[PDB]
Design a protein around this ligand. Structure first.
Ligand code: YR6
Ligand code: ATP
Ligand code: MG
Ligand code: MG
Ligand code: ZN
Length: 359
């Protein structure tokens, strides 16, 4: 109640930190975007600002920014890899015109691993010829489609290549985005007329990866929803309509960040990410579609609703991707049962003890 408000106060981003970080990031990102347009493959590349900073749910410090370098790929033909619902091979239809991505084809399949290698290579060469600014590239991770930069040893920038398709969303999405009773059927229809994205994250094949696979991304839609999040079009535009939706997501993010920090050397929580609590939070929005169910005065209850839904997800080992219902973020394949039981026990103790990990 009063204690949660004091936590939200401490999580607020400093105006001075925002001013310095926003300037540093824009300078680096604008430069790379310019250099990439100069390569034959990446002529159409455009910027999408995404994740928690641009959703206004970043907590503590503005020290991690996300951007998509998107690229329209006309006449795309997707093939689902192995019923995984989220991972696809990219092929092309008949096209008289030369394909600008020819260099990355393996037979008829656009190689995610080749395209990412060149993307990463270009960015690497380019961040040397930045001289005015201190910028290094961190080592490639199999988990992330992103190239990660560190600016002035303090600010991380994740850049993901993203193919843009203006086609209908794949069939795996048909029962996703259950926003009809919250944001309206007409908004669901408008969002589903927007493009979708594919990022070069590869699917599991036995011991390793199917290195040519891409994964669906709806980061653009997640941002649209968080920054236009009410049943009322004037939600949070006036003092009579201040909801606690973003406050509840910030508190869930802080709960996980604090537990991950406390066990950062003991492995049990390494497989959990902020995307787990972001996804769970969108599900609680579907369950609680009225702005009256997110009144600022009910912060403690609204936060409890998010905590108990997340606990139910851990116990049942079910957390659907918000866009792709048959994609289980909490499957055995991804997170072993012992890790989920360990997180459940820490979160139960926090809920039973008024969240001492916040104090
Ligand atoms: C960059 C950027 O800009 N827009 C989206 C975007 C972007 O990151 C993604 C998109 N679209 C995305 O899918 N990222 C991703 N996917 C899986 C994972 S994991 C290893 O499966 O947990 C992670 C991830 C890995 C390590 C640490 C961490 F914190 C997160 N990250
Ligand atoms: N497993 C995932 N599946 C799909 N999209 C993901 C996944 N992980 C991350 N993303 C997308 O990439 C964005 C950036 O991810 P990132 O890990 O930086 O988290 P975030 O939402 O910015 O929150 P924070 O950085 O504060 O933890 C997410 O908001 C989401 O749209
Ligand atoms: Mg982020
Ligand atoms: Mg990131
Ligand atoms: Zn609101």
């Amino acid at each position: 109640a009063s204690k949660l408000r004091a936590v939200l106060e401490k999580l607020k981003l400093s105006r001075d930190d925002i001013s310095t970080a926003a300037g540093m990031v824009k300078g680096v990102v604008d430069h790379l975007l310019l250099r990439l347009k100069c390569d034959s493959a990446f002529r159409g590349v455009g910027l999408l600002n995404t994740g928690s900073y641009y959703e206004h749910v970043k907590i503590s410090a503005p020290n991690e920014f996300d951007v998509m370098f998107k690229l329209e790929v006309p006449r795309i033909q997707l093939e689902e890899y192995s019923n995984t619902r989220a991972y696809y091979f990219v092929k092309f239809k008949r096209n008289p015109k030369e394909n600008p991505l020819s260099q990355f084809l393996e037979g008829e399949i656009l190689s995610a691993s080749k395209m990412l290698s060149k993307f990463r290579k270009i960015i690497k060469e380019e961040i040397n010829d930045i001289k005015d600014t201190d910028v290094i590239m961190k080592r490639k991770r199999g988990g992330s489609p992103a190239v990660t930069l560190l600016i002035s040893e303090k600010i991380s920038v994740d850049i993901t290549l993203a193919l843009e398709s203006k086609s209908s969303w794949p069939a795996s999405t048909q029962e996703g985005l259950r926003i009809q009773n919250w944001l309206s059927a007409k908004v669901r229809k408008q969002l589903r007329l927007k493009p979708f994205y594919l990022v070069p994250k590869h699917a599991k094949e036995g011991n390793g990866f199917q290195e040519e696979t891409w994964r669906l991304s709806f980061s653009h839609i997640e941002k649209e929803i968080l920054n236009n999040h009410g049943k009322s079009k004037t939600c949070c535009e006036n003092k009579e309509e201040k909801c606690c939706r973003k406050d509840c997501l910030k508190l869930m993010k802080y709960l996980l960040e604090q537990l991950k920090e406390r066990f950062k050397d003991k492995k049990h929580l390494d497989k959990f990410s902020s995307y787990h609590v972001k996804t769970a939070f969108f599900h609680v929005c579907t369950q609680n579609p009225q702005d009256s169910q997110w009144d600022r005065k009910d912060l403690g209850l609204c936060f409890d609703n998010c905590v108990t839904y997340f606990l139910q997800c851990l116990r049942t080992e079910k957390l659907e991707n918000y866009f792709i219902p048959e994609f289980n973020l909490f499957s055995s394949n991804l997170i072993d049962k012992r890790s989920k039981e360990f997180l459940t026990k820490q979160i139960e103790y926090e809920r039973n003890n008024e969240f001492p990990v916040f104090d």
